[PDB]
Amino acid sequence: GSHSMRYFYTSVSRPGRGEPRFIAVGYVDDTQFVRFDSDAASQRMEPRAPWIEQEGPEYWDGETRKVKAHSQTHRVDLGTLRGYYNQSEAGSHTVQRMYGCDVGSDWRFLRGYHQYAYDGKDYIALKEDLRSWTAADMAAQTTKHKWEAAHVAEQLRAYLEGTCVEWLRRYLENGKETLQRTDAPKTHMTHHAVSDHEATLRCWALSFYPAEITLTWQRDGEDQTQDTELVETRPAGDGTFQKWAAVVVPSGQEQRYTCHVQHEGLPKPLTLRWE
């Protein structure tokens, strides 16, 4: 199918306590492979996947220099935004950045993206034509004018359409055993007696990859979306994910309820019913 490479950066200001904390992480699809922590003693971009360690010291030197550059740009952006919004230095603030590229089944460039956020809310983003910017406030409008003047869109487009996708391909090839795999979910069902007349049925999907899944409960084949409890997909800690969905049913009606599981590792979606 399609694949993605994405870099996430986060810098939070510590007033008076020191320079802003900066943390960066890299992902291919749903697998992390690099990190940087400005509070860490190494002060290096470190590997987090086994298939990226095959890279020599030059790759790491380059990625460390680049991530430090991005840290410095964030360090300036914090004050720039504090000025654009007329905020006092006493407050701790957050600047988040995320960019990357998606590739199709032919492994050709499919799309790119580049977005910023301040204190948790959208600040500016690159449009899907890779030629224009969407801005939220008048400060984002100012950043947009600056970037339109400096021809940022053309350079970013060149990067995304060349190097981002090329090294996404190379990472997919180096870590084919990890990244080019699909793990179907192992599914089962659980039954407990919440009351003398009600019982909770719980549909479990475990040990699946990629994280994109869908669990649906149905009654008489009708969607139970409003009365089904559905937890966020959670990481198992070893490259796989977990999820479950529960419904409360009157005792003696379980055979009317079905759990439907949709995942790329399944040839057909699964239908489960209590026995």
């Binding site: 990625e63 680049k66 550059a69 600040y123 940022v152």
Partner: peptide, 9 residues
């Protein structure tokens, strides 16, 4: 691999 340019707001 990361982008080489320094981008400011």
């Amino acid at each position: 691999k990361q982008w080489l340019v320094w981008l400011f707001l």
